[PDB]
Amino acid sequence: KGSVVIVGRINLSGDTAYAQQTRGEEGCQETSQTGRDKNQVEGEVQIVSTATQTFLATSINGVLWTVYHGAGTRTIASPKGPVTQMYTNVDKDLVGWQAPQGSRSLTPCTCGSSDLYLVTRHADVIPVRRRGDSRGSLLSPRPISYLKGSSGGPLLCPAGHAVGIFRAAVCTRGVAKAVDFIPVESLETTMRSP
Ligand SMILES: COc1ccc2c(O[C@@H]3C[C@@H](C(=O)N[C@@H](CC(F)F)C(=O)NS(=O)(=O)C4CC4)N(C(=O)[C@@H](NC(=O)OC(C)(C)C)C(C)(C)C)C3)cc(-c3ccccc3)nc2c1
Ligand SMILES: [Cl-]
Numbered sequence: 001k002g003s004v005v006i007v008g009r010i011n012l013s014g015d016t017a018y019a020q021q022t023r024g025e026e027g028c029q030e031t032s033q034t035g036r037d038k039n040q041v042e043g044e045v046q047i048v049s050t051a052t053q054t055f056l057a058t059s060i061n062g063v064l065w066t067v068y069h070g071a072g073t074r075t076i077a078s079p080k081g082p083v084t085q086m087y088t089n090v091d092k093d094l095v096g097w098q099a100p101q102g103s104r105s106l107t108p109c110t111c112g113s114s115d116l117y118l119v120t121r122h123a124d125v126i127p128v129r130r131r132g133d134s135r136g137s138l139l140s141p142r143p144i145s146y147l148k149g150s151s152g153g154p155l156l157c158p159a160g161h162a163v164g165i166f167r168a169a170v171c172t173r174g175v176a177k178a179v180d181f182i183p184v185e186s187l188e189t190t191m192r193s194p
């Protein structure tokens with residue numbers, strides 16, 4: 001037990017992304033135990049933590065999504081107390097918590113662009129060439145440590161719409177050359193499933 005806690009956020013707003021920390025380790029541990037977090041949710045991407053891992057969560061279609069390998073079946077701390085997951089799919093590595101009515105959320109990409117942008121937990125905005133529904137190649141190889149903690153973050157198109165959620169890196173001898181992600185169409189199938 002213990003809730004996932006929002007510890008920071010990434011603001012995309014104007015041409016350059018920036019990360020903002022909102023909670024330190026002590027406040028995080030306290031918040032995880034109660035599940036009560038009075039902070040209002042802002043920004044396009046949330047930086048979230050459990051007692052052992054930090055990763056990202058992204059709101060799309062009014063649901064805050066993240067990876068199961070980070071969140072497990074945990075609740076998320078909120079102003080109204082711990083929020084139980086609305087969606088849980090171990091096979092897709094996907095978790096979603098319903099966000100409050102009218103909260104800011106990304107909309108799906110329908111433009112078919114293959115020019116994607118991955119937002120990391122350090123607010124780096126990396127170009128990615130789409131290769132299939134759930135894969136994209138990096139334009140520069142990166143050490144795997146550069147992407148650690150970015151699972152749950154968004155892949156965006158040039159119009160700033162959501163293409164998917166970052167899940168895993170294609171890693172060979174510590175070098176990431178491509179990314180594996182959960183496409184927004186798959187999040188929508190999860191939302192439409194009873
Ligand atoms: C359907 O496709 C998938 C694909 C991957 C899944 C998964 O991946 C695991 C988790 C993921 C990962 O480690 N994600 C990183 C980002 C990465 F760039 F480093 C992350 O931020 N999360 S974390 O674990 O560090 C935690 C937050 C701090 N993996 C990988 O990135 C691996 N690559 C990989 O698996 O590539 C394939 C898919 C091409 C084979 C390595 C570690 C070698 C780089 C292996 C883990 C799980 C999973 C689900 C539920 C419970 C437990 C595990 N399901 C997956 C389903
Ligand atoms: Cl679009």
Ligand SMILES: [Zn+2]
Pocket residue numbers: 108109110111112113157158159160161
């Ligand atoms: Zn688009």
